[PDB]
Symmetry: D3
Subunit: 123 residues, 6 copies
């Protein structure tokens, strides 16, 4: 039904949490339509590879399923891992501060459209 | 103590989540007092019937008991809509995407639990 | 595809390991064709363990299996019989059960080794006919 | 950065949840800076070993990391495990009533400083 | 320190076991140096399975290919995957022993030697 | 019925696997009778590894075990000694440790194999008296 772009941020990779994050997406009922470990370099940031991340390794993925956009953001949790993110979310269970909150998901069908076109051309 | 009836809906059985759902119940501190995989045929106001809270298909019925069992099960299960209502950390919040296929049902009150238990587990 | 009978014995119920045990069966790719928590009557216990009559441990097996409720299930799928035995592990949870099995991960001694699975095709048919005559 | 005191109450030890509770602290990004299984006898109760626990075995730990105090309270959940603790917390996932809610974490920076000096002198 | 090729076979994607398989690789202490979900073509499948000279399952659905790196990565991955037959050979606690039932659908593949690791990596991840 | 000494070596502490290791001991049915995170003194190191003195690698053992904190524990229960060795797995995490063990699932090489458990009843008594004098 819906498609959303999810990024596992560099801190998520450095902490060996790639599979744990994918598992929570998969058990939610969502499917991994695209997946790739990427390296993003240095050099406002709207529509670029650095829009939601700092330069470093990142895992991009197209997540597909019913209500995928809203469900991914549900799984991820609020921005601040302690102040806003609910327990049981990726950020609530695994993160401490906003600067290193592990994951990003599209915030709208509008964003998912361009984001997916940016990271997975022709998808 | 306290008793409530749980149903693992057909979508929960199809997705191989029987043990996962029971595990969450047990780790909460609740005990499985009864348990049975059932089949329910299509019956053509659904109150007090086997199809009250489920559609036609296989289902696992279970009596769960323990302190605050009724509210505890409702907490573990989560709100109706697994994305807009169910909190993360719940069965529905963690494993489901749409209301029609939200995996589980738990009695919402003592009188419901009493009625549903006698239906699915006569004599218990 | 095959069918086998799985028993979660009273110690597995007492330890609230029902979900964990069923989870290991499901993730293995096997399906639960029948499932029931029940108490074992003296008659059924003597039927289930008929092969052990005359052996010194026969009496204690009957006592234990009737000491508390069990969970019986029919597990179905490709090579279900051998797959369940693999998941369960060897008899002695420490000296025989490999790590990663139910007994290897959760049990310490033989008389409290949590689960049982039919040991062969003939036993599977015999035990299913006994525990689930309608299946 | 911060440090807080965690107690695993006797009921948490009885239910064999020491590793589970410690596991949830570590996967949050926090570190166990000190740890000890203690026995506490029975003797208001402010500043004493029995302030947040009844007599019985207890596991005391110093938990360290960014926002450690608030993070541990988040992981633990509200007092009543069913009416207050959120799903995905230790109490929301593992406990049923306030009398046996498994775990305690310092509720403030002053409590952490005070509780740490009591359970781990010289720390 | 070694590199090895890991393939999550089409049955592994279908059963939504990508994260579970990668989790076991990571907790073992190994790192994911490359990762990609992709569809396998006839040409590539013939190169990978060129060892069988005497209509392929690898081209039915997508697969996840990955380079896994770390100390004794090659042997460690084989240990994690388990023997070929998930019931008769794979040890409990392995990917196959815990999640699979028959050789036809044993979920995952890992390079069986240093030589095959280099040939498989050069085939699936040229330029890596 | 038995007690054994369990060490989470500095690499197990560095990798934040304390809870994972304790969980595997607990779910096996074993109990934690003693538990403490501590730093190993020079004296304690030479005492724990005294059986390796004179060997060339004796210096590397002392340096590693004092390179960072450890968690020491007394694990108790039926067959606790053999059960802990079962959970930990063989020495080499890849070539000897079985899948499903602590070393088989989390470690790659011998010098960083995370945990140690007493290998016999004599060793258990000797190691407990050294690490937990009052126990």
């Amino acid at each position: 039904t819906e498609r959303t772009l999810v990024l596992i941020k560099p801190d998520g990779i450095e902490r060996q949490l790639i599979g744990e994050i994918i598992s929570r997406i998969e058990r939610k009922g969502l499917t991994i339509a695209a997946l790739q470990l990427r390296t993003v370099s240095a050099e406002p940031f709207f529509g670029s590879l650095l829009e939601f991340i700092t330069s470093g390794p990142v895992v991009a993925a197209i997540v597909e399923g019913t209500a995928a956009i809203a469900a991914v953001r549900q799984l991820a949790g609020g921005t601040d891992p302690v102040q806003a993110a609910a327990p049981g979310t990726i950020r609530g269970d695994f993160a401490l501060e906003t600067q290193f909150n592990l994951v990003h998901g599209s915030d709208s069908a509008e964003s998912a459209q361009r984001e997916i076109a940016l990271w997975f051309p022709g998808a």
